[PDB]
Design a protein around this ligand. Structure first.
Ligand SMILES: CC(=O)N[C@@H]1[C@@H](O)[C@H](O[C@@H]2O[C@H](CO)[C@@H](O[C@@H]3O[C@H](CO)[C@@H](O[C@@H]4O[C@H](CO)[C@@H](O[C@@H]5O[C@H](CO)[C@@H](O[C@@H]6O[C@H](CO)[C@@H](O)[C@H](O)[C@H]6NC(C)=O)[C@H](O)[C@H]5NC(C)=O)[C@H](O)[C@H]4NC(C)=O)[C@H](O)[C@H]3NC(C)=O)[C@H](O)[C@H]2NC(C)=O)[C@@H](CO)O[C@H]1O
Length: 391
């Protein structure tokens, strides 16, 4: 194939208002190599629909089909259905993976659920397995998924269902839940969630996803970087080419205790203000940060972490822009990784009119440029935030 651009689509972006309202049709069919639908759900231990909107029933197409319709314009595109995520909790996953009967019950529900809806594979987003029991059962679930997927592919003579998983970057989390060598052997590839290294759960300011940890940081702290985390999965037994490194189209926000101290690892009095469209304190969509910059926000590039943050009053945002991204893509190329994962496709300037470069998908578009050599076309150019906004 080459390098992968795996984009996560979220079915709750449909509920956003004005510039943030996102429908599947807002995805260019050749933007990504894989689209992962977030999320499916679990019910009675079986793969089920999150809510009716995703399913098509009344002769009105649901979100599943509206997504998978993208494969008509681009046959080479692959779609997966992801189950889990944060809001899903762990308890249901523990119970599903507990016994072989519990697992197989899930597995044999999943395969027809996926085929009947024209999905090409399955993404397991259990956050996270924890303890020695989960560590074993997590592996068992992946193994038995792989086995069955394989068997089915041969019986029905179709290309095999893909099996993937989103996995964490917190060293603690990893050690405690993931038999990495085996976990990787059964997955087709690995979505490394190289983000949420820092957030409103901390009394300090920190970047959502630095490539390298600052000098300001503590040595134990220094472990928190996209570079350390990724190399840590290779060290534990993961194949380089199965690692798809996560890239955030969102930023984690803070409120400065004192707006005069706006440097990274400054004291913060809690999370930053909610975005107007995302409506959740502690983060903003990249297009929501563009608005801040284009309305008096100051921009700062941290040449240590190779990522930027922005400030407006006592509001502090760590994010990724085209400069931050590209540098990362080169990093991927350099370390020979599988490609890029993107959380999310719906929080990039998908419309083209917000950040101001008049280019749809400036970020993921730049990932596809660097990794797969496909121009954003025309004369589109990175917005040069430095000059554009105050310091
Ligand atoms: C005690 C202490 O100090 N502990 C520290 C420890 O916490 C630190 O470690 C860090 O911890 C934090 C939280 O404790 C971790 O944060 C979680 O990180 C995971 C990834 O590992 C995130 O999950 C994936 O990433 C995306 C991005 O967040 C997730 O997207 C979220 O998904 C949820 C639901 O799935 C969305 O909820 C939706 O909210 C909207 C808005 O209101 C609502 O309308 C929707 O209805 C609702 N969803 C539904 C289904 O209804 C949420 O919006 C979205 N976030 C977005 C879009 O920005 C997604 O779940 C995961 N992706 C895939 C793929 O599965 C998780 O979100 C995140 N949680 C929180 C609360 O932040 C962090 O990962 C962890 N990092 C590290 C490095 O450890 C450590 C380090 O400082 O120190 C300890 O001391």
């Amino acid at each position: 194939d080459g390098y992968k651009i795996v984009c996560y689509y979220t079915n709750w972006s449909q509920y956003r208002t004005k510039i943030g309202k996102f429908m599947p049709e807002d995805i260019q069919p050749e933007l990504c190599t894989h689209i992962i639908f977030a999320f499916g759900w679990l019910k009675k231990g079986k793969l089920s629909s999150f809510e009716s909107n995703d399913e098509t029933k009344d002769g009105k197409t649901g979100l599943y089909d509206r997504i998978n319709a993208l494969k008509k314009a681009n046959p080479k595109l692959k779609t997966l259905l992801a189950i889990g995520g944060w809001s899903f909790g762990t308890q249901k996953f523990k119970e599903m993976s507990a016994t072989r009967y519990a697992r197989q019950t899930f597995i044999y529900s999943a395969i027809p659920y996926l085929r009947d809806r024209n999905f090409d594979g399955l993404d397991i987003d259990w956050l996270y397995p924890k303890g020695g029991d989960d560590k074993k059962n997590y592996v068992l679930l992946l193994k038995e998924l792989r086995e069955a997927f394989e068997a089915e592919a041969q019986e029905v003579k179709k290309p095999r269902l893909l099996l993937t998983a989103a996995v964490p970057v917190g060293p603690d989390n990893i050690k405690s839940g993931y038999d990495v060598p085996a976990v990787a052997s059964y997955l087709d590839f690995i979505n490394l969630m190289a983000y949420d290294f820092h957030g409103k759960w901390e009394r300090e300011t920190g970047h959502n996803a630095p490539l390298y940890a600052p000098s300001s940081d503590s040595e134990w702290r220094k472990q928190l970087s996209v570079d350390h985390a990724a190399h840590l999965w290779v060290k534990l037994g993961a194949p380089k080419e199965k690692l798809i490194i996560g890239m955030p189209t969102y930023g984690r926000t803070f409120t400065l205790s004192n707006p005069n101290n706006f440097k990274v690892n400054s004291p913060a009095s809690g999370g930053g203000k909610a975005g107007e469209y995302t409506k959740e304190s502690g983060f903003l969509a990249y297009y929501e940060v563009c608005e801040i910059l284009r309305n008096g926000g100051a921009y700062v590039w941290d040449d240590e972490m190779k990522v930027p943050y922005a400030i407006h009053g006592d509001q502090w945002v760590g994010f990724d822009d085209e400069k931050s991204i590209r540098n990362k893509m080169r990093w991927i190329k350099d370390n020979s990784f599988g490609g890029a994962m993107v959380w999310t496709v719906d929080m990039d300037d998908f419309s083209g009119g917000v950040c101001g470069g008049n280019v749809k998908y400036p970020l993921i578009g730049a990932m596809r440029e660097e990794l797969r050599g496909i121009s954003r076309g025309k004369d589109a150019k990175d917005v040069d935030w430095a000059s554009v906004a105050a310091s």
